Design a protein around this nucleic acid. Structure first.
Lengths: 68, 141, 57, 241, 199, 62, 100, 141
RNA sequence: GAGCCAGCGAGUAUAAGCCUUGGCCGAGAGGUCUGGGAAAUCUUGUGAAACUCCGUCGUGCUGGGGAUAGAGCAUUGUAAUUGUUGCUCUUCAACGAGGAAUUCCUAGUAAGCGCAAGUCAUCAGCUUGCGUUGAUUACGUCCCUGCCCUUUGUACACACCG
RNA sequence: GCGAUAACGAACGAGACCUUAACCUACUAAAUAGUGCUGCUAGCAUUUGCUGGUAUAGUCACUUCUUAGAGGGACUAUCGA
């Protein structure tokens, strides 16, 4: 399966904590933003971080979630 | 240059490059008619870019193909896919985008290969076995 | 990682020595400068002092 | 209705009424139920096609894409004439240009950058040349709470999606992430003015507001009896008024 | 009704494929129906194809094979015996000679002949371990139908002057009528005859 | 005879090696006669199972 | 005006690309025409040898690869300039040779 | 609109050209065409043994016709098959060189093939016409 | 007989010689005279083999199968006898689908089919790769062989081969 | 991994990573790749056409095919449960 590891999850958590207003609900815009914010040294890792962040944002909209 | 498009078409390793320029209904394979290449059976796969849609899409266009690679079946599949791509690209840049949408709907309702090339490759052979997955026979005692 | 392996010729036999060093990627010049899973999200400079309708010229 | 994606771009021309160039994100901007009739599909874009507007001559089109190029097409023959290259970032707006490089570069008729005015700080957003005969000034906008114009229209509570201009070059409406529509002397995406009435037709995510799939382009028609806007559900939904 | 003469000539029969897709341009995929409804949703004859060679991806997904031409299914099932593996042109030649020879012998449509033979060559009772006899699934009944038909043909064609397509024809005729003169139909006797005792 | 029973819900794969699987069948003539049976081969919902008798119950086999 | 040809090969891609851009810059301070660079398909020298230093254990093999990249650029320029154009580019790891 | 060698099935084309060139009787059929064998990796002589050389000559002449500047080695490898090496596995083996050389030299003297620049034999100017006209008769039927 | 469709690679010069094209001889093996290539340049489109067509055979140990054996022609090598290998004629053996047992495999996969590279003066029924044709059947289970985690018992710890 | 928690914070392994296969008519260049055009030609037909051949000078154009560097592209994206 595709279970997200701890690196991508913690990266997404810190993105949401430290840049919440900038992040959006769109995977492509999130890609271009995570390119600017963090310094991942791989396209794949950057994409996984950004996409899981988009999923987290799309969850946060329906009420606060515990952990962020 | 008067009216021309350039499209390709592939299979296992067989590659077909099309040359669809304005013409008189001439449809050729390496310089030979669609009515024969080598085989006698699989001719209808390359007939499909015609019988599905009718011959009238080729009234004023002349097509040339330089298929090279793969094998007989692979070349046939690559040729017919390249013919479909060339016809679609001609309708795109010259004839009508609505026309090409109708044509590609016909193809995709018949065979996704006509527009979407098959992305299958021979998996590499691994040591400890003759094939990619096959193994040398094991002899317990 | 840089490895050096040597054969130490003792009186009773041969001893073997292996030395591995994991240098920090910061001092790496002609290559990667961090581990693949090292991520370097930075801080923010978002905070600032504003006012609804200013136009200074 | 033929877009496979999200219809983000719409523009009209006062030279060819009934001509609609609806954009999308699927590498193709298209010439235009039984009402909307497609005309031609423009092939040559690499990625998301942010916006396109028909040129003032009423013939060609100026396209922008997330692949760091401004694409200058030929409506009548379905060709591209020039490929502007040099913005190190996705472009999303002499011709002015805005991109993620945070820099505005000036392109001439053949296309060769000649002026490199700079001074923003975060992802200069949509920019438009003012249709003001009084002066050739431009009202630009960015994501650093800045709508500086070449006049600094700053002081926002966040980044701003885009800007729109009056048909005389006197009023600009700034709206987007800033829920309020600030205007000088929710999330909005496709606000634009009109050259014939007193309206504020926009395309906020929450809904349409005057004065679910989502419209990123809600351009006004030339005649003034249309407000169609292409949602992300692949259809533009013609609106009569 | 439509004259489209172009620079290169196209034969009369190939100018008969514009209005009906036909296997070898000789059989109609628009009249043949399946006797029983339990062997319908797992067979597709409402999609005629000129040849029994598409080489689709019918093993990728779970029920990706359900959407396979019965002609390709039978033709692929003839590619066995080992020395014949990966010889599909030979098999399509065999199946066209088949369709021909059945039509010379039968009065119905050989597509109908084979469809009936297959829907009547799938045993209903077979047993798993004594073996607790259970009722077989549709797709399985189908695939043993085709498998047994190809086997019967193959072992009839061993050490016999009657050629492979001829053995196939006789096996298909005997399994089409439902008579216990086909290799599959006698096995269709044995599977239930044993399976009933196993209950 | 051959009664026709359409499976509406899919159970687990019982049996020794797991080849067989339990199925719940219905009937287009005796509608409220849902009987649990077990199928040798692959199964889906709405797959009509042409049986040969419908007076026996299959629950779990070795 | 002559037909001086420059051909250069290496095992490292980045150093070769840097030195090729260097010769382009050196011919661009003057105005020597640049027909290339043209990129030959890379040579992969493959050696497959048995891991074990003896004959015991599971049959495992090592696939060693050496990769060779060749490039050609055609320069039309007086014979004097190409001499310095090449001999000032002595970047390590790239062996460069000059032929008319 | 005329017709050439590329518009015809190979089987009947080489059939007709071989039988016609036999009808002339001017091709120098070697005196060993009854004793010798076609290939070292062959086990029997041609069955139609009194006219097989004319078939081979027609096929070779067409093979040059479709190409340019081919030689004896290329044709030898073209006509070589798969040897039956016994208990050992199969392998491609080159065909007979003397037969092919004599065939192309006889085609030379009938003026059907010419000695091309820097290796090989092209087809002669008159050979093109001969093959094209002999192809035009079959397609009329 | 006719159609003649890939892909991975390798190659030398005062050699003791590399890939070898063309021309010419011999049935073939092979010989010789030139030419190209230190190679995306020539060998090489490696026109590979399975495969397609049209003919002979016609159910049989038969034109299936090609052991064993004699004669002859060459090639490599200082040296082929214990046949190095290649080619020609002749000899025409077992074997009619394999017992109890047992191996490998899920898609461009198995199986078929060749091809190149290593070993290499000569010799590939071998490996390492490569492509050509291209399937039936699952897409589940712990019955067998095993593996992982927890609970539990143990007089085991050389650890149940205790 | 979500979580549960007498733990808390860590480290190796796994994953990331690297090589390769698949996509790009969207950049950059090919006289050791190709496609055209244009010369000089040949067989058929004579409608300017169909098949080819040759010209690393024609002091031709270009990059679909092929090559290789710079990148882009999948993140399970959207939707229904």
């Amino acid at each position: 399966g595709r279970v997200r590891t701890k690196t991508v999850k913690r990266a997404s958590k810190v993105l949401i904590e430290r840049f919440y207003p900038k992040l959006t609900l769109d995977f492509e815009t999130n890609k271009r933003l995570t390119s600017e914010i963090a310094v991942i040294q791989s396209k794949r890792l950057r994409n996984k971080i950004a996409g899981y962040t988009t999923h987290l944002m799309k969850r946060i909209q329906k009420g606060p979630v515990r952990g962020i | 240059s008067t009216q021309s498009v350039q499209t390709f078409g592939k299979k296992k390793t067989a590659t077909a490059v099309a040359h669809v320029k304005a013409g008189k209904g001439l449809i050729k394979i390496n310089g030979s008619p669609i009515t024969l290449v080598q085989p006698e059976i699989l001719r209808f796969k390359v007939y499909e870019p015609l019988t599905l849609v009718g011959l009238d899409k080729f009234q004023g266009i002349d097509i040339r193909v330089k298929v090279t690679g793969g094998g007989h079946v692979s070349q046939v599949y690559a040729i017919r896919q390249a013919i479909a791509k060339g016809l679609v690209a001609y309708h795109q840049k010259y004839v009508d985008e609505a026309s090409k949408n109708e044509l590609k709907k016909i193809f995709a309702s018949y065979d996704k290969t006509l527009l979407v090339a098959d992305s299958r490759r021979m998996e590499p052979k691994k040591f400890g076995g003759r094939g990619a997955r096959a193994r040398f026979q094991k002899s317990y005692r | 990682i840089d490895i050096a392996i040597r054969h130490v010729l003792m009186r009773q036999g041969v001893l073997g020595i292996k030395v591995k060093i994991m240098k920090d990627p910061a001092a790496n010049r002609f290559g990667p400068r961090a581990l693949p899973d090292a991520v370097k999200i930075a801080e923010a400079k978002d905070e600032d002092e504003v006012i609804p309708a200013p136009t200074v010229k | 209705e033929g877009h496979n994606g999200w219809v983000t771009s719409l523009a009209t021309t006062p030279a060819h009424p009934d001509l609609l160039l609806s954009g999308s994100r699927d590498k193709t901007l298209i010439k235009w139920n039984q009402y909307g009739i497609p005309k031609k599909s423009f092939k040559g874009h690499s990625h998301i096609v942010q916006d396109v507007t028909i040129s003032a001559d009423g013939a060609y089109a100026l396209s922008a894409s997330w692949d760091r190029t401004l694409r200058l097409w030929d409506l009548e023959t379905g060709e591209t004439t020039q490929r502007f290259v040099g913005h190190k970032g996705d472009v999303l707006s002499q011709i002015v240009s805005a991109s993620r490089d945070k820099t505005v570069k000036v392109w001439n008729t053949i296309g060769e950058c000649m002026a490199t005015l700079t001074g923003h700080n975060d992802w200069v957003s949509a920019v438009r040349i003012s249709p003001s005969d009084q002066s050739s000034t431009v009202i630009s906008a960015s994501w650093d709470k800045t709508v500086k114009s070449w006049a600094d229209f700053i002081g926002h509570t966040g980044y701003i999606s885009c800007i729109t201009l009056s048909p005389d070059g006197s009023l600009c409406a700034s709206a987007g992430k800033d829920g309020v529509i600030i205007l000088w002397d929710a999330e909005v995406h496709a606000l634009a003015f009109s050259p014939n009435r007193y309206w504020l037709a926009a395309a906020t995510t929450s809904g349409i507001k005057i004065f679910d799939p989502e419209a990123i382009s809600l351009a006004w028609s030339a005649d003034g009896q249309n407000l169609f806007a292409g949602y992300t559900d692949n259809v533009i939904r013609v609106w009569q008024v | 009704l439509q004259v489209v003469e172009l620079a290169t000539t196209i034969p009369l029969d190939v100018q008969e494929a514009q209005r009906e897709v036909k296997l070898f341009n000789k059989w109609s995929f628009e009249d043949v129906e399946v006797k029983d409804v339990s062997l319908v949703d797992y067979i597709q004859i409402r999609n005629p194809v000129f040849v029994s060679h598409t080489a689709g991806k019918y093993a990728s997904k779970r029920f990706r094979k359900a959407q396979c031409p019965i002609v390709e299914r039978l033709t692929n099932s003839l590619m066995m015996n080992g020395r014949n593996n990966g010889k599909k042109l030979k098999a399509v030649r065999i199946v066209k000679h088949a369709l021909e020879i059945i039509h010379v012998l039968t009065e119905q449509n050989p597509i109908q002949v084979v469809v009936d033979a297959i829907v009547n060559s799938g045993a209903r009772e077979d047993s798993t371990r004594r073996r607790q006899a259970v009722d077989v699934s549709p797709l399985r009944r189908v695939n043993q139908a085709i498998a047994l038909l190809t086997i019967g043909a193959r072992e009839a064609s061993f050490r016999n002057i009657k050629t492979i397509a001829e053995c196939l024809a006789e096996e298909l005729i005997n399994a089409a009528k439902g008579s216990s003169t086909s290799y599959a139909i006698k096995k269709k006797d044995e599977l239930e005859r044993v399976a009933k005792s196993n209950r | 005879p051959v009664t026709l029973a359409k499976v509406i819900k899919v159970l687990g794969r019982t049996g020794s090696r797991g080849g067989v699987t339990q199925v719940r069948v219905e009937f287009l003539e005796d509608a409220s006669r849902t009987i649990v049976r077990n199928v040798k081969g692959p199964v889906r919902e709405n797959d009509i199972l042409c049986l040969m008798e419908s007076e026996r119950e299959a629950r779990r086999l070795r | 005006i002559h037909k001086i040809r420059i051909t250069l090969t290496s095992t490292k891609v980045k150093q070769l690309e840097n030195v090729s851009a260097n010769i382009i810059r050196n011919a661009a301070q003057y105005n020597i025409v640049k027909k290339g660079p043209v990129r030959m398909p890379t040579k992969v020298l493959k050696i497959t040898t048995r891991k074990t230093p003896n004959g015991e254990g599971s049959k495992t093999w090592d696939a060693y690869e050496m990769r060779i990249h060749k490039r050609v650029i055609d320069l039309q320029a007086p014979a004097s300039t190409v001499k310095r154009i090449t001999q000032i580019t002595i970047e390590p790891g790239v062996d460069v040779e000059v032929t008319i | 609109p005329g017709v050439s060698v590329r518009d015809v099935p190979a089987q009947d084309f080489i059939n007709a050209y071989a039988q016609f060139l036999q009808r002339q009787g001017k091709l120098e059929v070697p005196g060993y065409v009854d004793i010798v064998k076609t290939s070292a990796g062959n086990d029997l002589p041609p069955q139609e043994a009194e006219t097989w050389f004319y078939k081979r000559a027609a096929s070779i002449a067409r093979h040059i016709y479709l190409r340019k500047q081919v030689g004896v080695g290329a044709l030898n490898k073209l006509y070589g098959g798969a040897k039956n090496r016994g208990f050992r596995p199969h392998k491609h083996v080159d065909a007979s060189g003397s037969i092919n050389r004599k065939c192309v030299q006889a085609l030379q003297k009938i003026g059907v093939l010419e000695i091309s620049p820097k290796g090989g034999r092209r087809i002669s100017e008159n050979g093109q016409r001969d093959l094209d006209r002999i192809a035009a008769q079959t397609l009329e039927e």
